[PDB]
């Protein structure tokens, strides 16, 4: 209920939603190219 | 782009201003010259008038003796060829007597005597003029603060040529007047006391002289900023707080955490400037007196790796 | 004395550079004293006075005697507003913006902020006005760059919204402050000269917009102008740079506005 | 601990969570410089030894 | 602010818009910074190249410092 | 934790990045986007540099030194221990610089003034840059620039200017300690009298810029006024900077040889070259 | 995690989104030159 | 009843609930790394 | 220890805080760096040793 | 009554106790860290 | 001796106080950085030397 | 009475003798401290 | 020497006592220093090998 | 003349004062100088 933003608690669901959608698609684009480099050229 | 106040805009021109007359003799003041159009792009284009009291004349007789003194040198080493002495003018000197006369009068005219000559002259110059500083704030009533910032510089320029010759018990020392053969003296000083660079007053001296830079580029660059409100009249601000000094205190406030007034940022500007002078001056004393190689003195002080 | 250290490596130089260290310390200590003359003791974001005052203490009072017989100052001393500021606190936490209640340039917060000085003229070593129009001044006249009188004036939205019909000049200084500018309803305001941009054909003010000209506080005497209306005018033409954003058509700022 | 909270009476949220993603950032960023210096805990350079990489 | 003629981009639903207006706030931000550092690139660059034309290696300085 | 006027000027407004997301202060300081940059920059330069005290074995503060990557290590990059350290300490410092220089347009822009000072500040950071960026890419190392320590940025400056001789006889060099000595004469000037106007004699009233005029025109015949003694510390101090900058920057990269060969020009002019007595005769 | 969201109840999104995607650039640049600062790794120093 | 923010004692504890939430989530990640360095490369 | 409290009354928390975050940080920073200094106490460089990672 | 902050005095010694808390848990953490490091390495 | 009270009415008593608490500061520090710089009188180095702690 | 400070002469007289009971007992302490230092080890 | 007192009405006694106290301080320490420089009377020194510290 | 503005007796009473302190450290200062002429005399 704090409301610094102005924005609502559903708002900032939908909101959290779709932030959080594009950081796993980022996050798995990561991966798969951490994938690459390791069999690439492994650094462990 | 927005107009940055760095060059007027325009000039207007008005009566000649004569000036104040709260003590001054107003017959030893000169007449107003010329009006100089170029000047007033940047400041005020009015020239004079000029004061020309007793301690202006004693300045203005002694200093033209010494720049005639070492003008008639540099015609003599230049076999008074006129081309030549074009030619050589940045390499022309006059130097100070040999080591071997010691602090005596007696080394000969062409090797050291005509140095000794104009070096009188010079100090009477740079004497009576800050004579001549002094008794100018005097007659306008304001304070000696303009006195006693050249007398910071009278300090480092008499160590140089005076106070450290005497010390080290040779003429010698001193430097020679020409533009190159002091620039070499100046090389030659550091080389001698190895590596002036870890005399640790040239440092300071060197870090107030950078601070000077940074603090006039500072105070400059805020009143020019703030000189849409009048900032620029800075004796009003002092007198009469108006939004351009508040605007200035609080830009360095909510920059770097602090800030001055209108008033002490010029005590900071003056402290910051007779510094590297007065620091200047005590580390060319104590080099040779006391120091006679700074690496090693730095050395033994932790501020050079070996050792 | 080369080489005489009264104790370990301690010599003349070690002396020196250490009594300078002391003497730094003293002269940052008075240089901070100085320096805390104007706006302590330090308030809360509410007015009272706020429980850190810094390390610093506040130096003893100093009068200085206004010449022509102003009066005098005595700094540090009691000083306000002595002005309604139109700001409503936007957190209860200190260290945040004040929002303006009103219209900031008419309230005179923020960037477009005045303060409560003399309503009297500024004054010359002579005591005559400092500040004069040229028309007034005796032998005073234009001498060098592109003569502003009869030019337009243009806003920051691109819009004629006057002409320049007299410049005020310093007259110790002989440098122009104010350009006075009639409107299109016959009534005259003043310009900082350091806020306009004297052109070949018209005289740019970025700060403002035409149609903010009108606001400008104006000066109750034709003739002279005191501290205070200067502090109101130069706080409402500099107040327009960040409050007249929106009607400024500067092409970048159209571009980025596209974007964001 | 269970009056913990009460940190929450005193400092806004805005500038503590601002300090402390600052702060969060800056030591991680120093702990991994730290690791990198040292020859040992080099990751890189404990994998070219490995793989035979630097000549 | 004027109304778009082209109206196509108007058939996708909202939450594919809220995406795409997030997506785009992150890219501005990177891609000024991307510009920052490229800019940035292209001046070490343009020095690198005029080093280049000079005769940087018929007569080069000898190290300023120690080496470490 | 505000001054007496304070409370008036702190609005929203004026940010470059971030809107109102950083747009608080701290105590007195102003954060902002760039602020917080120029925080995170400087507290990671700052650490390095002790880490690197660590890795360099000496706790004394003047004997602190970050050397840059050797000659042979050219424009890439170093191993930290050995340079590399350097390296992350100059992006960090080039950092903090711009970040600060953005944090006080920001500054000026919530005040409505102008941008002369983080405009003044750009040509510090430039010289800069000169002398850890655009100098050494240039010559095509990394070990042409300066270590980061105390007194062995001293011996950087020492030795680079011992390469070429006395480096007095660098013509820019010569024009850039024109302008620093000239605007330190013109510094100890400008708060002399204006400490001497508003801090007269005893008992007599506070002087006018009248007065100031007066004296300086009674002192030197001229006297350049208040805004123009602004405009020329300004000036002077950029202008120096400029210059040195300048100087280092045709240093090692268009000249090689002693300067002194330098200013050999005017003493070979055809027509008074061969024209015996004199110093070069 | 199920009360993460009302982080945007105390940041604005868009200037997050904005400093975020500037933090993500700058911290590719910055592994990415780290990567060239080792001998191995360093993909742009192609020799003979 | 001391107020500087302007937090109610229920709106402190919510957002303290979530920030320890976050403070956990990310000293568990933390632990894990750790773990997973130390089997890589012990330190003791 | 029974009227300590009354500093409160005295030192405003927020400021109290934030002192002495910013002193326990940098404390412990200068600790840390201090025994990583030392050849003994280095834990980075004991690990290595013990199990013999400089070859 | 001094009042410098403004804070009373059952305000006070409400702040003193959870920040003793704080500093006592912080403490402990400490001193078993002490104890760990002296038990796998004494500087004593 | 009787009248030195006078003093307090010419010397701010504050700044007084403030001066000379620097003042015995620095006067302190000042002797015994003299007795360690001697080799004499240093009594971390006569420690040592009396329990043979170099060796 | 000058009074260039404000003091009456009454708190002249109780600041200066509170003063000399404080410095009274620097001395003291300075005196002990130079006694154990000449016994143990003497400088004339 | 009896009238010295009128000394008070041409300087100002808080000044002059502040002038007095530096310059008394820096007087004897450089005294103490010059002492101390000089191999005589350099008591630390005297001490040490009157004793046989060294 | 009355530049610091005492009265007579002010300025007797802040002269008797001051040559109390005076004589005070003067006769410390002797009885130093003659301790250290005993221990080493410089004449
Ligand atoms: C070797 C040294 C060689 C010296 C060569 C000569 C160099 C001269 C340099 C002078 C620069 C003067 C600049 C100036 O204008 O002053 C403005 C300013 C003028 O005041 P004002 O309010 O405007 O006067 C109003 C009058 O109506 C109007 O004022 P006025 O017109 O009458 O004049 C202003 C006043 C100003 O003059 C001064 O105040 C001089 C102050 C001392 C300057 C000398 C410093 C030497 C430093 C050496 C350090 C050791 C190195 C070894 O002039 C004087 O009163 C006499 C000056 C004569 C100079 C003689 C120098 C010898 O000067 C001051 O009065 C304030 C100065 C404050 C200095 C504080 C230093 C602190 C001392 C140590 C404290 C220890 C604390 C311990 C803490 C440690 C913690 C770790
Ligand atoms: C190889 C050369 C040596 C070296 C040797 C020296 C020596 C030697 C000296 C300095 C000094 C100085 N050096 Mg060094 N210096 C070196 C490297 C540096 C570097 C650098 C980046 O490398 C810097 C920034 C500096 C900077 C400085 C200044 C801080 C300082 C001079 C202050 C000043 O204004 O003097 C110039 C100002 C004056 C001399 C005062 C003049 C005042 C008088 C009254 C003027 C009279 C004018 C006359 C009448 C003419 C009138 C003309 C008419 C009006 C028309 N040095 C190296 C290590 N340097 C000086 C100093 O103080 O050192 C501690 C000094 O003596
Ligand atoms: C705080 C230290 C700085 C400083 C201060 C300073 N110099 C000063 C002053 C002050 C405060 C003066 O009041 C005085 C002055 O009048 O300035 C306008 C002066 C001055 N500083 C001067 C020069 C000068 N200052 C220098 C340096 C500096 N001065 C320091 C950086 C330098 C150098 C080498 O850096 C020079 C060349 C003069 C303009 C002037 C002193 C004039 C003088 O003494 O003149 C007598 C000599 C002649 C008249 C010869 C004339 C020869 C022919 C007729 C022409
Ligand atoms: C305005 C301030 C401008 C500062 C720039 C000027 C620098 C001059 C310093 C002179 C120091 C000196 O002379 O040393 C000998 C003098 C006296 O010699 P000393 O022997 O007694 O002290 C040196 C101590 N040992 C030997 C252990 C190294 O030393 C000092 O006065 C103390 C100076 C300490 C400076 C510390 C700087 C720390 C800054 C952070 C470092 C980050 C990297
Ligand atoms: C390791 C590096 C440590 C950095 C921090 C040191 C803090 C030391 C303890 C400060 C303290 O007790 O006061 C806290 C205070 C908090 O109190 P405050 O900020 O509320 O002060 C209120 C203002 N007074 C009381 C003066 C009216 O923090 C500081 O002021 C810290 C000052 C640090 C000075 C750094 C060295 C300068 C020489
Ligand atoms: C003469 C010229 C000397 C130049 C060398 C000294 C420059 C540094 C000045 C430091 C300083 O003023 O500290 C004050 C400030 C104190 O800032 P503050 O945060 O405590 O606020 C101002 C203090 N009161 C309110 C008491 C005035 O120091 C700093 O903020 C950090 C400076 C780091 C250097
Ligand atoms: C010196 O130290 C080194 C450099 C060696 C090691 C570094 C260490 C450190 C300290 C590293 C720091 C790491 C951190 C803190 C990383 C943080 C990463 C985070 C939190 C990233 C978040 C990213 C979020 C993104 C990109 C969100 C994007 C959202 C959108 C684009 C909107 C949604 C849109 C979608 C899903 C598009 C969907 C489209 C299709 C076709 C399915
Ligand atoms: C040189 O020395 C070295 C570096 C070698 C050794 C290092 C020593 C030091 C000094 C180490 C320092 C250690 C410290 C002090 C570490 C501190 C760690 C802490 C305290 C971490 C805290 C983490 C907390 C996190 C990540 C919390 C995240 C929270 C969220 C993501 C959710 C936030 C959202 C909220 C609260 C929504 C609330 C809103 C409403 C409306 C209720
Ligand atoms: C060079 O010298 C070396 C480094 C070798 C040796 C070091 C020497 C020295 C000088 C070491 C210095 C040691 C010192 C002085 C250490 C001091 C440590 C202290 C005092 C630490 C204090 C820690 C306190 C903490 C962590 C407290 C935390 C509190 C909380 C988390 C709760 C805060 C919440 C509150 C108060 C709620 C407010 C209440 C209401 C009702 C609104
Ligand atoms: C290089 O030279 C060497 C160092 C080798 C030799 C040194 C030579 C020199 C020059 C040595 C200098 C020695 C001097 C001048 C020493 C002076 C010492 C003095 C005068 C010390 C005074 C100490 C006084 C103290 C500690 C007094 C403390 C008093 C209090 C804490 C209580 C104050 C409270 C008051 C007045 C309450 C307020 C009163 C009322 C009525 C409200
Ligand atoms: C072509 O047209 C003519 C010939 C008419 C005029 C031309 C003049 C020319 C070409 C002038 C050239 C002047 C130059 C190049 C001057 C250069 C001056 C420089 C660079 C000076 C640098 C440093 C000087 C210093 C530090 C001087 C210090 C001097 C003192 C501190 C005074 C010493 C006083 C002494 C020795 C008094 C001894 C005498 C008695 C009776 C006790
Ligand atoms: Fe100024």
Redesign the interface.
């Known amino acids: 209920d704090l409301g610094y933003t102005g924005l609502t608690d559903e708002q900032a669901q939908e909101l959290h939603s779709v932030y959080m959608s594009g950081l796993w698609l980022f996050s798995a684009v990561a991966i798969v190219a951490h994938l690459a480099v390791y069999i690439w050229r492994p650094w462990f | 782009a ?14 000649a ?1 004569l ?2 007359t ?1 003590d ?1 003799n107003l017959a030893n ?2 007449g107003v ?1 010329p ?1 100089s ?1 170029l ?13 020309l009291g007793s301690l202006g004349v004693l300045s203005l007789f002694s200093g033209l003796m010494w720049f005639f003194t070492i003008g008639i040198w540099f015609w003599y ?3 008074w ?1 006129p ?6 003018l ?3 000197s006059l130097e100070p007597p040999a080591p071997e006369y010691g602090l005596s009068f007696a080394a000969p005219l062409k090797e050291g005597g005509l140095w000794l000559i104009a070096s009188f002259f010079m100090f009477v110059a740079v004497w009576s003029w800050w004579g ?2 002094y008794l ?11 006195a ?3 007398l ?2 009278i300090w480092l320029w008499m160590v140089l040529g005076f106070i450290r010759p005497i010390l080290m018990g040779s003429w010698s020392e001193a430097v020679p007047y020409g533009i ?1 053969s002091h ?2 003296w ?2 030659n000083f550091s080389l001698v006391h190895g ?1 002036l ?2 005399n ?2 040239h ?2 001296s060197i870090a107030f ?1 950078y601070g ?19 900032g ?5 601000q ?14 360095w ?22 510094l ?1 002078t007065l ?1 200047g001056g ?1 580390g060319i004393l ?1 080099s ?5 190689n700074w690496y090693v ?2 050395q ?6 070996l050792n | 004395m080369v080489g005489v250290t009264a104790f370990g490596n301690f010599d003349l130089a070690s002396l020196a550079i250490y009594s300078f260290w002391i003497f730094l310390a003293g002269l940052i200590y008075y240089l901070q004293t100085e320096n805390m003359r104007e706006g302590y003791p330090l308030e809360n974001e509410d007015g009272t006075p706020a429980a850190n005052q810094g390390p610093f203490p506040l130096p003893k009072p100093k009068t200085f005697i206004l010449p022509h017989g102003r009066g005098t100052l005595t700094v540090p001393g009691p000083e306000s507003e002595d002005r309604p500021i139109a700001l409503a606190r936007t957190a209860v936490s200190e260290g945040f913006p004040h929002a303006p209640t009103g219209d900031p340039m008419k309230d005179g917060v923020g960037p477009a902020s005045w303060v409560a000085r003399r309503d009297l003229p500024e004054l010359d070593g002579h005591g005559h006005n400092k500040i004069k129009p040229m028309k007034a001044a005796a032998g005073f006249h234009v001498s060098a760059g592109k003569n502003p009188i009869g030019l337009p004036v243009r806003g920051c939205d691109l819009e004629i919204a006057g002409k320049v019909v007299d410049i005020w000049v310093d007259i110790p200084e002989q440098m122009a402050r104010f350009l006075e500018v009639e409107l299109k309803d016959g009534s005259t305001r003043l310009l900082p000269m350091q806020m306009v941009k004297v052109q070949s054909n018209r005289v740019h003010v970025n700060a403002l917009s035409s149609d903010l000209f009108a606001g400008i506080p104006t000066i109750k005497s034709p003739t002279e102008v005191t501290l205070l209306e200067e502090d109101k005018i130069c706080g409402y033409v500099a107040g327009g740079l960040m409050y007249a954003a929106p009607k400024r058509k500067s092409v970048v700022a159209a571009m980025l506005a596209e974007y964001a | 601990m269970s009056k913990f909270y009460k940190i929450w009476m005193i400092f806004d949220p805005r500038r503590v969570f601002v300090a402390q993603g600052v702060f969060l950032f800056l030591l991680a960023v120093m702990i991994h410089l730290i690791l990198l210096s040292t020859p040992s805990y080099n990751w890189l350079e404990i994998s070219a030894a490995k793989y035979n990489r630097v000549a | 602010a004027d109304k778009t003629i082209f109206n196509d981009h108007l058939n996708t639903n909202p939450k594919t818009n809220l995406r795409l207006w997030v997506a785009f706030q992150m890219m501005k931000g990177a891609g000024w910074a991307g510009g920052v550092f490229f800019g940035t690139l292209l001046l070490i660059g343009f020095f690198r190249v005029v080093g280049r034309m000079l005769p940087i290696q018929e007569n080069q300085a000898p190290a300023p410092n120690i080496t470490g | 934790a505000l001054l007496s006027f304070e409370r008036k000027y702190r609005v929203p407004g004026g940010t470059l990045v971030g809107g109102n997301l950083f747009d608080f202060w701290v105590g007195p300081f102003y954060v902002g986007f760039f602020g917080v940059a120029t925080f995170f920059f400087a507290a990671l330069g700052i650490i390095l540099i002790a880490w690197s005290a660590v890795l360099q074995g000496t706790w004394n503060p003047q004997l602190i030194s970050v050397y840059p990557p050797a000659l042979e290590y050219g424009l890439g990059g170093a191993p930290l221990a050995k340079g590399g350290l350097w390296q992350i300490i100059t992006i960090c410092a080039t950092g903090a610089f711009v970040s600060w220089a953005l944090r006080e347009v920001e500054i000026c822009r919530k005040l409505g003034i102008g941008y002369h000072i983080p405009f003044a500040f750009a040509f510090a950071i430039l010289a800069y840059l000169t002398l850890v960026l655009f100098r050494p890419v240039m010559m095509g190392a990394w070990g042409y620039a300066f270590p980061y320590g105390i007194w062995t940025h001293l011996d950087w400056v020492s030795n680079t200017g011992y390469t070429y001789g006395n480096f007095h006889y660098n013509p820019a060099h010569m024009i850039a300690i024109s302008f620093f000595f000239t605007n330190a004469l013109a510094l100890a000037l400008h708060g002399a009298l204006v400490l001497s106007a508003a801090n007269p004699e005893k008992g007599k009233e506070m002087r006018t810029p009248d007065h100031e005029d007066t004296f300086f025109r009674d002192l030197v015949g001229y006297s350049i006024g208040t805004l123009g003694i602004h405009r020329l510390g300004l000036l002077l101090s950029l202008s120096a900077v400029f210059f040195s900058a300048l100087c280092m920057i045709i240093t090692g990269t268009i000249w090689f040889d002693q300067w002194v060969d330098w200013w050999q020009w005017w003493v070979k002019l055809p027509w008074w070259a061969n024209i015996p007595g004199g110093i070069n005769g």
């Open positions: 927005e107009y940055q106040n760095i060059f007027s805009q325009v000039q207007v021109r008005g009566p201003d000036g104040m709260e001054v003041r000169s010259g009006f159009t000047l007033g792009w940047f400041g005020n284009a009015q020239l004079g008038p000029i004061y080493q230049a076999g060829n081309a030549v002495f074009l030619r050589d940045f390499f022309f001549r500083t100018r704030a005097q007659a306008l009533g304001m304070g000696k603060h303009t006693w910032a050249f910071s510089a190159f620039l070499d100046t090389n590596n660079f870890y640790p007053f440092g300071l002289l000077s830079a940074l603090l006039f580029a500072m105070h400059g660059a805020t009143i020019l900023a703030v000189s849409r409100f009048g620029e009249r800075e004796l009003e002092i007198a009469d707080r108006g939004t351009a000094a508040e605007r200035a205190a609080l830009f406030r909510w920059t770097m955490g602090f800030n001055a007034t209108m008033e002490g940022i010029h005590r900071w500007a003056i402290w910051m400037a007779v590297v620091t005590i104590l040779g007196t006391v120091v006679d003195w730095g033994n002080h932790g501020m050079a790796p």
